[PDB]
Design an enzyme around this catalytic site. Structure first.
Site, PDB file in Angstrom:
ATOM      1  N   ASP A 124       0.020   4.664  12.436  1.00  0.00           N
ATOM      2  CA  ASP A 124      -1.258   4.855  11.748  1.00  0.00           C
ATOM      3  C   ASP A 124      -1.671   6.328  11.698  1.00  0.00           C
ATOM      4  OD1 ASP A 124      -3.733   4.433  10.533  1.00  0.00           O
ATOM      5  OD2 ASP A 124      -4.701   3.535  12.269  1.00  0.00           O
TER       6      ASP A 124
ATOM      7  N   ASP B 192      -2.908   8.261   4.753  1.00  0.00           N
ATOM      8  CA  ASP B 192      -3.140   7.198   5.757  1.00  0.00           C
ATOM      9  C   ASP B 192      -2.098   6.084   5.661  1.00  0.00           C
ATOM     10  OD1 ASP B 192      -4.111   5.363   7.600  1.00  0.00           O
ATOM     11  OD2 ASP B 192      -5.969   4.918   6.508  1.00  0.00           O
TER      12      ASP B 192
END
Ligand SMILES: C#CCOc1cnc(C(=O)Nc2cc(F)c(F)c([C@@]3(C)N=C(N)S[C@@]4(COC)C[C@H]43)c2)cn1
EC number: 3.4.23.46
Length: 380
Positions: free
Chosen positions: A34, A222
């Site tokens: 992440d 992201d």
């Protein structure tokens, strides 16, 4: 870095995970990669969705920080107990470090029922670490405690649920994962991996918005978001142009809003009526930009758990945001992305594994001349 190639796994829509070990003796866990958060957080209790979880009682190297952390997101949340322990990445560098670990002890709408991961690896910076920036992120610990270079790169390769894969190269770049040249955009500020978009085209056609709108209040890269998320005003203009470009077929309003799927007979998806999308990114040099281009294969995504249909059904995976632009998996699956933390920049190159057809392909091209790029950044 051949040991690290193909070290990522996942299922469509459930993220990309890497194998890690925690504790002594090592407890193996699958951990979501992440770039949009900065905590290393792992299931530490027998939630029914989890294949496994961190058992602090079995680790001799476990140290308790005697402090909790509560982490709400917009729709989910978790709560944990902070500590440190020894952490490694089996298909990563041959090193072991003492890292902060949030042992997740309560959660709501966080873990995915049917997924194969049990924790998250927040690879962003300390500024957005919870509870505060004194909790050193994993990658910062890794670099501080070893000789691993301060960079990593990601090749996310898109596909009952199709398996996805890819590579996280820790401490380097593997030239087998991309073609052509890398092009770099500055990391504007080290919190999220914040970048500045300077121009947007749909099939070559400039949206012609004040570029500040493209980055209101920010634009980030992201790996933990599926969609390309756009600021509302920008999404509105972007949909208007995509609708027009694809007007040889009509779809309901809900499809564009992500409120319903659209389906076509097996093998009859009209890729070509959908336009390419190009994001020009601020370059390394004054007045210089470059552009990345993605296909509908990226932003029109198969949904493979629709039991009530027999056809090929797709989700429109561009969506409106109130938190700025999010370059999620829709963008990253087209490119090899280099998180060059050492030089505060992010590199893009055409991914050797990106999904395309015989007519169009993902592209990274430059240099272009773009003036007033500093004006594209949002300030309060
Ligand atoms: C495969 C595939 C397509 O790409 C992805 C990427 N990420 C996911 C995913 O499930 N990400 C995810 C799931 C969460 F429950 C979750 F809490 C997060 C968090 C930690 N990280 C993000 N980058 S988005 C987020 C809010 O931002 C911090 C919800 C937080 C990501 C799914 N598919």
């Amino acid at each position: 870095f051949v040991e690290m190639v193909d070290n990522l796994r996942g299922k469509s829509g459930q993220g990309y995970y890497v194998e890690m070990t925690v504790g002594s003796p090592p407890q193996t866990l699958n951990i979501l990669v992440d770039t949009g958060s900065s905590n290393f957080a792992v299931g530490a209790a027998p939630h029914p969705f989890l294949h496994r979880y961190y058992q602090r009682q079995l680790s001799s190297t476990y140290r308790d920080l005697r402090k909790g952390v509560y982490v709400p997101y917009t729709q989910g949340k978790w709560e944990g107990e902070l500590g440190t322990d020894l952490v490694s990445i089996p298909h990563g560098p041959n090193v072991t470090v003492r890292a902060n670990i949030a042992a997740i002890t309560e959660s709501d709408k966080f873990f995915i029922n049917g997924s194969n991961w049990e924790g998250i690896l927040g690879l962003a910076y300390a500024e957005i670490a919870r509870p505060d920036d004194s909790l050193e992120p994993f990658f910062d610990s890794l670099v501080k405690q070893t000789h691993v270079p301060n960079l990593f790169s990601l090749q996310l390769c898109g596909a009952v649920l199709a398996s996805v894969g890819g590579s996280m190269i820790i401490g380097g770049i593997d030239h087998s994962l991309y073609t052509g040249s890398l092009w770099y955009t500055p990391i504007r500020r080290e919190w999220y991996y914040e970048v500045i978009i300077v121009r947007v085209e749909i099939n070559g056609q400039d949206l012609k918005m004040d570029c500040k709108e493209y980055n209101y209040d920010k634009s980030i890269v992201d790996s933990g978001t599926t969609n390309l998320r756009l600021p509302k005003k920008v999404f509105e203009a972007a949909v208007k142009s995509i609708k027009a470009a694809s007007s040889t077929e009509k779809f309901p309003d809900g499809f564009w809003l992500g409120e319903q799927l659209v389906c076509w007979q097996a093998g009859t998806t009209p890729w070509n009526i959908f336009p390419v999308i190009s994001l020009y990114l601020m370059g390394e040099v004054t007045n210089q930009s470059f552009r990345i281009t993605i296909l509908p294969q990226q932003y029109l995504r198969p949904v493979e758990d629709v039991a009530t249909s027999q056809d090929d059904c797709y989700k429109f995976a561009i969506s409106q945001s109130s938190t700025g632009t999010v370059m999620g998996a829709v963008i990253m699956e087209g490119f090899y992305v280099v998180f060059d933390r050492a030089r505060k920049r992010i590199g893009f190159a055409v991914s050797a594994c990106h999904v395309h057809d015989e007519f169009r392909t993902a592209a990274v091209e430059g240099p272009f001349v773009t003036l007033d790029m500093e004006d594209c950044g949002y300030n309060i």
